[PDB]
Design an enzyme around this catalytic site. Sequence first.
Site, PDB file in Angstrom:
ATOM      1  N   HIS B 174      25.694  30.488  48.684  1.00 32.04           N
ATOM      2  CA  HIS B 174      26.368  30.505  47.389  1.00 32.04           C
ATOM      3  C   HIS B 174      27.219  29.238  47.248  1.00 32.04           C
ATOM      4  CE1 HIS B 174      29.494  31.703  44.475  1.00 32.04           C
ATOM      5  NE2 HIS B 174      28.585  32.522  43.978  1.00 32.04           N
ATOM      6  N   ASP B 297      25.504  37.437  38.326  1.00 31.16           N
ATOM      7  CA  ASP B 297      26.714  36.679  38.680  1.00 31.16           C
ATOM      8  C   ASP B 297      27.983  37.359  38.129  1.00 31.16           C
ATOM      9  OD1 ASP B 297      27.980  34.584  40.065  1.00 31.16           O
ATOM     10  OD2 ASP B 297      26.787  33.018  39.081  1.00 31.16           O
TER      11      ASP B 297
HETATM   12  C1  LIG Z   1      34.279  32.061  42.979  1.00 30.93           C
HETATM   13  O1  LIG Z   1      33.026  32.438  42.524  1.00 30.93           O
HETATM   14  C2  LIG Z   1      32.523  31.993  41.327  1.00 30.93           C
HETATM   15  C3  LIG Z   1      33.334  31.562  40.296  1.00 30.93           C
HETATM   16  C4  LIG Z   1      32.764  31.133  39.106  1.00 30.93           C
HETATM   17  C5  LIG Z   1      33.693  30.676  38.039  1.00 30.93           C
HETATM   18  O2  LIG Z   1      34.863  30.326  38.359  1.00 30.93           O
HETATM   19  O3  LIG Z   1      33.327  30.647  36.839  1.00 30.93           O
HETATM   20  C6  LIG Z   1      31.376  31.131  38.948  1.00 30.93           C
HETATM   21  C7  LIG Z   1      30.565  31.571  39.997  1.00 30.93           C
HETATM   22  N1  LIG Z   1      29.152  31.300  40.007  1.00 30.93           N
HETATM   23  O4  LIG Z   1      28.374  31.791  40.943  1.00 30.93           O
HETATM   24  O5  LIG Z   1      28.636  30.568  39.075  1.00 30.93           O
HETATM   25  C8  LIG Z   1      31.153  32.005  41.176  1.00 30.93           C
HETATM   26  O6  LIG Z   1      30.469  32.818  42.037  1.00 30.93           O
HETATM   27 MN   LIG Z   2      28.412  33.377  41.917  1.00 33.80          MN
END
Ligand SMILES: COc1cc(C(=O)O)cc([N+](=O)[O-])c1O
Ligand SMILES: [Mn+2]
Lengths: 335, 335
Positions: B174, B297
């Site tokens: 991730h 997500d």
């Molecule tokens: C801290 O984990 C995430 C944060 C965000 C965000 O701040 O928008 C997006 C995802 N993502 O997977 O795109 C994350 O998992």
């Molecule tokens: Mn994510």
Amino acid sequence: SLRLIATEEAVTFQPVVDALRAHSRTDDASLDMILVRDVYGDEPARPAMIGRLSDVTGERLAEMDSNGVDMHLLSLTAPGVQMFDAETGTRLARIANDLMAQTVAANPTRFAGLGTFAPQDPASAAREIERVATQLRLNGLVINSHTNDLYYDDPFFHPVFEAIEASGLALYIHPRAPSKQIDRAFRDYGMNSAIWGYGIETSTNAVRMILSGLFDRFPRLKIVLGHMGEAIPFWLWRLDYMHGNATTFGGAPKLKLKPSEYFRRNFAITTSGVESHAALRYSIEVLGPENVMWAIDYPYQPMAPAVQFIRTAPIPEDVKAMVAGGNAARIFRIT
Amino acid sequence: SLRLIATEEAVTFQPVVDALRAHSRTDDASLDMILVRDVYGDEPARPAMIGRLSDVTGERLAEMDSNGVDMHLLSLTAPGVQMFDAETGTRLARIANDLMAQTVAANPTRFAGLGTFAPQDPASAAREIERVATQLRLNGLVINSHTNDLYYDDPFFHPVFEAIEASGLALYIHPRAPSKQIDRAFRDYGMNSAIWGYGIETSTNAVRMILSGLFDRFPRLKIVLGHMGEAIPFWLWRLDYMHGNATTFGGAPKLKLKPSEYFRRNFAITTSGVESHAALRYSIEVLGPENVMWAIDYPYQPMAPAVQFIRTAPIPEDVKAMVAGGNAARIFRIT
Ligand SMILES: COc1cc(C(=O)O)cc([N+](=O)[O-])c1O
Ligand SMILES: [Mn+2]
Ligand SMILES: COc1cc(C(=O)O)cc([N+](=O)[O-])c1O
Ligand SMILES: [Mn+2]
């Protein structure tokens, strides 16, 4: 039948070659020094490259004839004049541009040309852009991603883009090796180069340009990206979706359009080094057929496979003609 | 009737939340500190996010029911336990995995789980990976890109990948914010986050893994990348083409396969945060339909649009079933 105009065709000239030979001996820490030593250095790993870049009317033209390529749009090869100090870069850009104009004038049905500049000195570069557009009457402009490890969202470069916008010339932002801001991660496995660093460096530059609101300030800019748009066409949905977060808590400025709208309005892309029918079809679908141009990336790529890629593309003949040369003719002012 | 298994669904637990709350007050220069302050800080810009991440059987389950989502495959949210010192990371990994297993056991038809680990101590992480596989019997593993600003080509992490390969568990890599090797270019316009930095950081990690020959050393590894493969599927032709240069004069090691062949053999992708039918079709075409999984997500993205994206995808029903949950059931051992 099919008119082929290749849009990312590198060339070099002796004054630039000489300056780069001298530069190859310095302690410059730029990641571009890997290329500069390999091609222009005293013990070159790629000894044939200088000759191949310099040649226009010999092997290059013979290969164009053998493969039925109508034109190359020539550009001074990366890293252009951007590695030199401001006075040197400024001087050599004028020289390289005059040589380009002469090269084009010698065979104007087979070669068009992009002028370059030395954004180390934005005011002098603004003057050169004006000269390239109005006196030399070249077809567009080329610059190789960063200059002085800064990206083109930096207000330092505003006089450049003001001049570019006023000129009506499209600007091809070609890669160079990752800047000092990011080069640490690209020292291994040849990642400094086309295999990965070139794309990350150039795409990140372009994304900063969009997100900083450069295209609200200069809405008539036309930017061209090679390598199937340095993958930005693939990221359009996410760029748009996450933009709200960026302006809400991320400190991004409010923009008039969505990120992907700037990309479709202000950018066009070429197929250089991405001879994939699937990636080509994707790009046409998400950008529109008017926004995609064919290229070879000669002499870093061979002509025959690039030519056969577009001749065999599973698209209608009218869209093929647009991609093969129609779009380039419009964008780069070629009759 | 369409079985929907969402594969990138973030969760957190109180012991991890409390540790990150404390970490937010420290002098850490990691680019992840932007997120950590925004979510876990004393004056958080995103004050609702801890509650949403922590919740499993309330809002999350209600949303799953109202949108007809069968399961969430849960993972400890970025940056996981990776920001802590080795001892703390190692301790919190065990705790989080125990809590993950309990969360799954409380509603095992609705939730599956990925365990995590602290690669700061490769030997201890190898032991926790074995425990996750054989004692907790979780469905796979998750890690958030880099650890200690090193990427996973580094031999330092060999004990980890040895353990993952032996376990047979797939590893979801991730994103987290760009490491210190690249973070200078991501400090502006919210680019630290999902809008750009997450993809560049994660795709660059993965490319280093492939080009370093990690998958010759551990050929049975399965890696999963979200965000439509962090655009790697788009770059496949260029990765392959330029590989010869990389091994010839770039210092990249000779590999048994082409870069794209490792990507298809050893990687699968999810659609988290890329709700584009065009990008989905492209990925299915170039990777094969067995290699693409649906995800939401949550809670960083809302469920309804993600669900409707896959419900309305212009693909045959049998392929849609593979993408919606069939592939995930295979890859992550879900009955
Ligand atoms: C801290 O984990 C995430 C944060 C965000 C965000 O701040 O928008 C997006 C995802 N993502 O997977 O795109 C994350 O998992
Ligand atoms: Mn994510
Ligand atoms: C110095 O200019 C280039 C060099 C290379 C290379 O070293 O393979 C490739 C491309 N390219 O566009 O991919 C360049 O234009
Ligand atoms: Mn090129």
